[PDB]
């Protein structure tokens, strides 16, 4: 049984620069090896086969190399739309095994987030629940710190985060932080604030509202 190892499993390469991806096989697969590109929400797409042969339609910047146990996929002149997870597949033994994948991140220039805060709608309060949402939009790098405050009291343990996949055109990420609380607790406080720390910001940004003004 031929196992494929793709290490490192993450790369961060600037636009216009070279990304070099590795794939190693536990046994020689000669040159019976394919490379696939999988963008988020999508199916894999064949890039290379026979370890070095480009599939018709694939840009010249995507190249393959290697034989036996060691293989490399080089992506020259990295583009924003190359943000995807790349998989190697050997077909020495039918029907083949895949590697675990290497996600290529486009290391674009720093972009500070645009922060928006959303109180719960009147239709949500009428349903019996409340939650407040803090949107961090179009930022890079992916690292960010979100802190919730309720009447200036620092919150902890009561918020859930969700992060988008890297954008195929602008190479940024977006994040939502949702402060979880009961409708009763929401009606017991006034000021809701989310303070954002990001390397693109020199001082943290706070977005807030006063419940009674909504």
């Amino acid at each position: 049984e031929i196992v494929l190892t793709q290490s490192p499993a993450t790369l961060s390469v600037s636009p216009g620069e070279r990304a070099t991806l590795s794939c190693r096989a536990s046994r020689s697969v000669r040159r019976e090896l394919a490379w696939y590109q999988q963008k988020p929400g999508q199916a894999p797409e064949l890039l290379i086969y026979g370890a070095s042969t480009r599939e018709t339609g694939i840009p010249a910047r995507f190249s393959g190399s290697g034989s036996g146990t060691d293989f490399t996929l080089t992506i020259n002149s990295l583009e924003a739309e190359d943000a995807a997870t790349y998989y190697c597949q050997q077909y020495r033994d039918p029907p083949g095994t895949f590697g675990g994948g290497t996600k290529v991140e486009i290391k674009r220039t720093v972009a500070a987030p645009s922060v928006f805060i959303f109180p719960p709608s009147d239709e949500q309060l009428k349903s019996g629940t409340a939650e407040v949402v803090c949107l961090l939009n179009n930022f890079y790098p992916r690292e960010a710190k979100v802190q919730w405050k309720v009447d200036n009291a620092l919150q902890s343990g009561n918020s859930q985060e969700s992060v988008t996949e890297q954008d195929s055109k602008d190479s940024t990420y977006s994040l939502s932080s949702t402060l979880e609380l009961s409708k009763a607790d929401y009606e017991k406080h006034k000021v809701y604030a989310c303070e954002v720390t990001h390397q693109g910001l020199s001082s943290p940004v706070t977005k807030s509202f006063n419940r009674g003004e909504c």
């Binding site: 797409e45 026979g50 077909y91 029907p95 675990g100 977006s174």
Partner: protein, 219 residues
């Protein structure tokens, strides 16, 4: 080439589900066709294969005896009957074509996949609520709007804005499965603040397992 999968959805453990894959654009009858699955947030694993005539079939060890691949070369359709389903079978199932040279098992075309959720949780449609600012800003040139898609099961839901006429600046976040066994997500969009009183913003939420369709006006 087109390979469109269907039949995916929620199924209780021990249950049965049949997937279908419809081919068009090529002579289906000449190629071997495969089922390849991808568990949530994981890689790719080949599942089953079928020769052009249907004589030769191959199965991944952990699915043998439970899964059966079949094909209809007049409808140009592939199937995967999956019985005795377990939690670890939960995955997006892709139907993919193996090259028709030399041979070589190369998956040259893949469909967009169909999600199969092996769980005992009951189907539930979401509640859709608007996400709008507390008050008018008066200083910023860009505004954000959204929709909260709350407490639903199973995945997936699709969100679009203005029936697909608004895609620019949309971000539909990956859903979060809370301790209650239900999913929630947000879809947001950024638009010029000058359009808030002229353009209408409607999030369209579709949750196919519960046959839920909600159009929510935002602002």
């Amino acid at each position: 080439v087109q390979l469109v999968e269907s039949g995916g959805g929620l199924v209780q453990p021990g249950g049965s589900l049949r997937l279908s894959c419809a081919a068009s654009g090529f002579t289906f009858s000449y190629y071997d066709i495969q089922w390849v699955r991808q568990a949530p947030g994981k890689g790719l694993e080949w599942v089953s294969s079928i020769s052009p005539s249907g004589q030769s079939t191959y199965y991944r060890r952990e699915v043998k005896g439970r899964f059966t691949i079949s094909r209809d070369n007049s409808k140009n359709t592939l199937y995967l009957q999956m019985n005795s389903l377990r939690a670890e079978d939960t995955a997006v199932y892709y139907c993919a074509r193996r090259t028709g040279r030399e041979g070589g098992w190369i998956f040259d075309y893949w469909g967009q996949g169909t999600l199969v959720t092996v769980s005992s949780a009951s189907t539930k449609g979401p509640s859709v609520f608007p996400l709008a600012p507390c008050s008018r800003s008066t200083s910023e040139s860009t505004a954000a709007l959204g929709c909260l898609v709350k407490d639903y099961f199973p995945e997936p839901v699709t969100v679009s804005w203005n029936s697909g006429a608004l895609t620019s600046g949309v971000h539909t976040f990956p859903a979060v499965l809370k301790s209650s066994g239900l999913y929630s997500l947000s879809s947001v969009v950024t638009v010029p603040s000058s359009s808030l009183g002229t353009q209408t913003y409607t999030c369209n939420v579709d949750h196919k397992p519960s046959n839920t369709k909600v159009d929510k006006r935002v602002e």
